[PDB]
Design a protein around this nucleic acid. Structure first.
Lengths: 207, 146, 117, 63
RNA sequence: GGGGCCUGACUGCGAGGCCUGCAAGCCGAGCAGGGGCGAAAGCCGGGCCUAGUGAACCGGUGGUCCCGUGUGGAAGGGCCA
RNA sequence: GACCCGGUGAAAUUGAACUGGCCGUGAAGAUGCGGCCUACCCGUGGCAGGACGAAAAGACCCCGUGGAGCUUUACUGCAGC
RNA sequence: GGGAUGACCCCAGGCGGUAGGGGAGCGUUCCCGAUGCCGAUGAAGGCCGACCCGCGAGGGCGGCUGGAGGUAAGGGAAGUG
RNA sequence: GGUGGAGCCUGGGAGUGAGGGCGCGAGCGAUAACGUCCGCGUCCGAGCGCGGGAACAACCGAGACCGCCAGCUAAGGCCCC
RNA sequence: GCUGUUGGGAAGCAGCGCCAGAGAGGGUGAAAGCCCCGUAGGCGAAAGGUGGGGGGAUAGGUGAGGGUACCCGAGUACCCCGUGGUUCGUGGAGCCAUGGGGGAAUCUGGGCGGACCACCGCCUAAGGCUAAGUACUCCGGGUGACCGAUAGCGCACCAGUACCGUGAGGGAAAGGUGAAAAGAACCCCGGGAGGGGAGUGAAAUAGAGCCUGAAACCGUGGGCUUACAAGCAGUCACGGCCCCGCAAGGGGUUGUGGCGUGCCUAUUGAAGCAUGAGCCGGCGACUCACGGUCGUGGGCGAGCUUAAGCCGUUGAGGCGGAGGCGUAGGGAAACCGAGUCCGAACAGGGCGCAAGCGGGCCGCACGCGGCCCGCAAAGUCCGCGGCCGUGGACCCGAAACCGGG
RNA sequence: CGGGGGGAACCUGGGGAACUGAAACAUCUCAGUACCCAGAGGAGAGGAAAGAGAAAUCGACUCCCUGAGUAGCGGCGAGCG
């Protein structure tokens, strides 16, 4: 049971330490985490796979030939499922793969993700952004002078568009926003960075 | 936690049951190998034989209702002071519904077993015997609704 | 997704076609004809592996007989000597002594029929 | 779509707490003309088995 | 087989069982109510015994404390026979 | 016409064949199992006994709570009168 | 029963099987993994292989063809043999 | 006594409700049928897997996890094939 | 953003830089943020629709007591008969519609509140009009755990064509050279078609229905093998012959001898002279949706949980307790309640309930409080899986019925 | 001044099946579905209570979630709702 979060040197004041609740490395359950991911990656499914059944094919019902004395196998309409001109048995139908995952679990799984990011140390919440002004060149520097060399795909979660503006167009960087704080991104990214305003809401959401 | 490893727990068993091949549930398709199971059987929840279903038993429930419909009526949902000793102070429906029982289930009685805490219990009717337990310190709100 | 047949089939097919090389007519050009022929080949072997084990017991006994008969006795009596005498040895297979070492074989016979005297 | 309760069953057999199916004893809606009080009387409720199991399956939505 | 009183060819129940796929069929001491016959012990919930029979649904007559579509009462039902 | 030669060149059929006879046997009518008898390899023109030969998911019979046409003092309706 | 839980070894039993119940695996297509990794020094496909791993379904590896796509672990879906 | 792929209770999923030969005890039949119906048992079904019986579902022997150029046998055999 | 390097061709590999609100994607001789078209981001209409989203303009509407008792939608209300609508199938059948007969009234009116009547209430029929929220997709765009030329629309291609039918109608097959035509001058055989060189190309077994080129099927050449033979075509055991190896050893072939009754389906029973199949390749059959019920992985438990939709994204989520299951059951019901029903019954009996704890650990009050745990007393919510129900519900297949032509 | 004729689906009104289901089948189901006809439009219909139904209540209508497989309807069958 350990819980201590980092915080980059704000303006000219040393690295401040801040922490609270079983938010940091508490008791992680991989399962719960994975289920919240399917839910995310799933409910984001388009679901537009369609096929025309025999009732739906553009052929006729007229009986190809007579049920008897033809010396040919018996048949109905060309549309039947066998036959090359096909019909398709149990083909795909437009449908929603989106279910309702328990809301209380959509949280314990949000906190737990911002937990295995803390214990690893890859967690880190800032407050200032000297080289902001919405320029990549500007941002790219701000990282080096922080610990963000580019060797660890990062997740940026700050309520400041000006900053996104930069982080955005970077490979190893995954922009975002506070309200959109999920688990699929936290996990896909090696290192997580969060502002104290987007962090401010984090808990208002968790508890 | 690494990206490629949150993996399904130890029992997601996507293992469906395809019934077509040489070994396993197969050919005649895992199950059936006779006939009258090719696109449907009759039930059997309640059907077949061709005989008296088991519908030989008669209707007691004498009052299946006329055609106008069921008759409007005050519905009483009794509660146990047993489950009532979970909180103290003022005990009235509303603080009761959004709490435990009732849930707009119309009116509220009150009876239960077990020890009763010496307070006020605002109910619509009290069960004789289970009211002598409130004769050992408590309240007795009655009627209401208008 | 649409799991079209494609590659998969054509592979298992030429896999049987391979097991079926050297067969007569279509027994080797037709998957089906092949498939069958192989099943027969499947049990014919299995059974003959057990037959082979009985096959050679015959070879041996016939020889063993022919050898200790031109010497003086039969196979019935000969195996009873090497048994009463107690020489639970030879093993009809190793009775190739009748083929290689007649001097060593003849010895066994002599100490075999003697087991009766 | 959804499932429909079986009114026929709903109208003649009651399902109790233990999950048991209970219905009247069949044999007295008119048979009678003289049946020794014992028979004509002896008619409260009763059970079934493997059979009530089949019932409950039709009184789902009505639990 | 005959005689004298009689109505237990009871109401409310039913321990425990025979039988059995289901539901049916069958036996039943014992407790209460109110009785018959007997001095009493006691016996009587039809018949020496095994055939003389028909789920449910729909309706009919009684009864009855139950429900009565805003209320009172109805119409119509439910329950017991 | 058929037969031989040059020219063009189909068809139903078709599990795969390295496809003989006799007693016997076997799901009771075997080229294909058993025993014995015969028997070099490949064709061409013929004959039709067998391959339960081809063809047609028997037109007979039965079965299906199958279907249609027809009848009538079958049931139940309707046109019409 | 060992028990440094060591699913790695011992002791003794079992292992024909249709309809069927149950248990673990193999391959196919698409998805996350992926702004990553294989690639013209040669992809996927194909053609051979007496070699290597699995009981099997399969999987590797090598030569030839071919000339531009392919996609691990770990999982997820389904027009899956 | 009996620790057995025995039992007993609860629950998920079944298939099967066309059986066949043989022996024994019956009926039917003509103490005829590879007949027919019951009863006890067995085997085939599903053991057309292996040995014997010339060949041969059910008769004798015997329950086939794999491999062996090793041995003892069962039934049935030991003149040749 | 140039250069060197491999090569037919760099974007590959390599050295050193750079833009980025723009590292979507497509193309370029292969695989490129920085080379080409694009992208983020930001401008744009003389003309034609769109247009209260924003202001005007008017249209049009503007008042309360107290007395009369003049008007308040007619073959109508209403009643009866015949029907239809509604959950309502003759039912106790009202209500709303109306084909037929009869047939008012103007608020002390009249319709309704499921016959009817009496109370108590509700609303004003027989004249119209009425935005927005809802339904659909020929066309336009945008995404896809959508298909990839037997797929996907019937049609990727001059297809509703060819072709078939008198007609309604039916209804196809058919994509791919290469980076680039550089698509082969000319010469040789030939009438031509075809080919042989030369020539183009990195490649011509990429040469023009030309990438890949599988299997069936048809040929040439070679190795082993057969004309005294007998068989579901193989298998086992030796042996000859050919062949890669340094060799133990291994291939290909088949001469003898041993042993063998195809596959599938259906069957008491099939090699069966029962069914099905010429052979190869490809298409080809247990699915999804919503309820239900068991199992099972997690979440939380006197509880659990959202639905439509609203603010958010545009592969990011929240909110939303209407509502639903559970917390109590008995009875036909009134109803009573750890009870209840039958009953006269502090007889009986039928459904009912009575539900905990190994104990981690702890305030060090010589109290086990009581958190927590297996997850329960006890359940719910989501996932996955078996089976059930409604759906064409495993795929083919009728003879037939009906409607419009 | 207007109409006529056309328009994939959608829409309203006027007509309106049978197969099926009930394991036969008449009422019931399928079903006011398919289909024919008329009209209208980017929508259409509906629309300001002679409404609801028990609350000193509510206050156009359309539309979605619930209520709800409820109340009932039902050869009280199937099944409808």
């Amino acid at each position: 049971m350990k819980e201590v979060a980092v915080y980059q040197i704000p303006v000219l004041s040393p690295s401040g330490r801040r922490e609270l609740a079983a938010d940091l490395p508490a008791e992680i359950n991989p399962h719960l985490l994975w289920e919240v991911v399917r839910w995310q990656l799933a409910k984001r499914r388009r679901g537009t796979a369609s096929t025309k059944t025999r009732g739906e094919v553009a052929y006729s019902g007229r009986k190809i030939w007579p049920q008897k004395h033809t010396g040919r196998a018996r048949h109905g309409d060309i549309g039947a499922p066998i036959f090359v001109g096909g019909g398709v048995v149990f083909g795909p139908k437009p449908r929603d793969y989106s279910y309702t995952l328990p809301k209380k679990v959509r949280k314990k799984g949000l906190a737990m993700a911002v937990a295995d990011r803390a214990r690893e140390g890859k967690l880190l919440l800032v407050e200032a952004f000297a080289g902001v002004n919405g320029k990549t060149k500007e941002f790219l520097a701000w990282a080096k002078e922080a610990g963000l060399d580019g060797s660890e795909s990062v997740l940026l979660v700050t309520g400041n568009e000006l900053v996104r503006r930069a982080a955005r167009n970077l490979p190893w960087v995954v922009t975002l926003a506070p309200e959109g704080l999920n688990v699929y991104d936290i996990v896909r990214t090696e290192r997580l960075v969060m502002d104290l305003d987007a962090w401010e809401v984090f808990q208002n959401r968790i508890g | 936690d690494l990206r490629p490893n949150p993996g399904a727990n130890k029992r997601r068993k996507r293992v469906g049951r395809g019934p077509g091949s040489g070994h396993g549930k197969t050919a005649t398709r895992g199950h059936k190998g006779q006939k009258s199971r090719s696109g449907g059987l009759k039930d059997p929840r309640r059907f077949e034989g061709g005989r008296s279903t088991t519908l030989m038993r008669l209707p007691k429930r004498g009052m299946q209702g006329q055609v106008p419909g069921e008759i409007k009526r005050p519905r009483y949902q009794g509660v146990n002071l047993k489950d009532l000793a979970r909180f103290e102070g003022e005990v009235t429906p509303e603080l009761l519904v959004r709490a435990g029982l009732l849930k707009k289930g119309y009116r509220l009685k009150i009876l239960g077993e077990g020890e009763a805490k010496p307070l006020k219990v605002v109910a619509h009717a009290f069960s004789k015997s289970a009211l002598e337990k409130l004769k050992a310190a408590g309240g007795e709100p009655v009627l209401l609704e208008a | 997704p649409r799991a079209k047949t494609g590659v998969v089939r054509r592979r298992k097919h030429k896999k049987i076609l391979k097991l079926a090389k050297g067969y007569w007519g279509l027994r080797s050009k037709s998957f089906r004809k092949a498939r069958e022929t192989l099943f027969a080949a499947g049990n014919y072997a299995y059974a003959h592996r057990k037959r082979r084990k009985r096959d050679f017991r015959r070879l041996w006994i016939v020889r063993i007989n022919a050898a200790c008969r031109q010497h003086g006795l039969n196979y019935s009596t000969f195996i009873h000597g090497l048994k009463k005498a107690g020489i639970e040895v030879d093993r009809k297979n190793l009775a190739d002594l009748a083929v290689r070492e007649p001097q060593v074989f003849a010895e066994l016979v002599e100490r075999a029929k003697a087991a009766q005297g | 779509p959804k499932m429909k309760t079986h009114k026929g069953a709903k109208k003649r057999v009651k399902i109790t707490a233990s999950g048991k199916v209970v219905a009247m004893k069949t044999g007295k809606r008119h048979l009678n003309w003289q049946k020794s009080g014992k028979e004509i009387r002896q008619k409260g409720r009763k059970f079934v088995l493997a059979k009530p199991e089949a019932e409950r399956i039709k009184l789902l939505l009505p639990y």
